[PDB]
Design a protein around this ligand. Structure first.
Ligand code: OOE
Lengths: 170, 170
């Protein structure tokens, strides 16, 4: 059940705030092409490396988008920032996108290690699936998600660069 | 049960990252006095205004701390920023601190309005209490919380500026 609140946290505190202003943020960057969707990686093993290039050398960080900021819960100018990556394939620039892991999967993996969290390591995968399932339902019936992001869930030769390219080509 | 994952999310994804580097961040600001603890507001009604001055005119935003940034889940240079407030009392500067609401309480209040979230409005208060109770337990046995933050839970004439001052004077 923990994954449930995390998916809803993931949407209320993020997806529903940056998704509406995301097209305008890519358009700016293009007119100093980055594709217009926010690609979200959901590894079901919940292994979420912080540096995306260490998961695959064919994913190269290129730049940051223009920051988005707002006052939130008493923090003046809270900062939402997103990175642009190029996807390479046989030495060729095959695509460019705003690409990133779903952070809460890291929370699930950290909750598993702490004994005080009452969350067993065996349950990581079932909660990862529940997290994806719930988030896909939240986005299916959401105004914010008007074709703004694509969830990339996968299980682990294996190329993830290829995985992103698969959905990117679609 | 949703509050449980939120408290653990609140710690793994925030408290345990900024708390260790918080003393060093205040010390910098002092040597261009801000008190050395991170004061976290937990309204049990889960009403979390974004601008802290609209909850009480005696809380005046003063400045931002030096930002803290790191690579996280594929975002290059993710930004953690915190605001410094002065607490006034009969026109007098009575205190200065890094003060802020616990954001997840906003998630609880948003989850209550959405029917798809399976979270009734009657349960807001019980989950707010469960959120505070869990977070107080996580911090009690935490290395990060070596006298770094004070939880300010309250229920609602009433002065909150006075509330913060109470714990501040201690
Ligand atoms: N004042 C303050 N508080 C913070 C901060 N960072 C974390 N917190 C606290 O910790 C909770 C869990 O953080 P998380 O583990 O990163 O999970 C996040 C993440 F998955 C995504 N997200 C949000 N901003 C993003 C960004 N900028 N990039 C990527 N992703 C993001 O939405 C979740 C919930 O976001 P919420 O805010 O609703 O709840 C948060 C909040 F209470 C911070 O900079 N300043």
């Amino acid at each position: 059940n923990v994954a449930h609140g995390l998916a809803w946290s993931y949407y209320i505190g993020y997806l529903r705030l940056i998704l509406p202003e995301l097209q305008a943020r890519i358009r700016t960057y293009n007119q100093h092409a980055v594709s217009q969707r926010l690609y979200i990686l959901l590894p079901l093993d919940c292994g979420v490396p912080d540096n995306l290039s260490m998961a695959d050398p064919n994913i190269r960080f290129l730049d940051k988008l223009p920051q988005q900021t707002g006052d939130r819960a008493g923090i003046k100018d809270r900062v939402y920032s997103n990175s642009i990556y190029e996807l390479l394939e046989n030495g060729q620039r095959a695509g460019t996108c705003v690409l990133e892991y779903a952070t809460p999967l890291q929370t699930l993996f950290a909750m598993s290690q702490y004994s005080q969290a009452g969350f067993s390591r065996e349950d990581r995968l079932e909660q990862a699936k529940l997290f994806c399932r719930t988030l896909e339902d939240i986005l299916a019936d959401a105004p914010e998600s008007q074709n703004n992001c694509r969830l990339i869930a996968y299980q682990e030769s294996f190329s993830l660069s290829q995985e992103v390219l698969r959905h990117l080509r679609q």
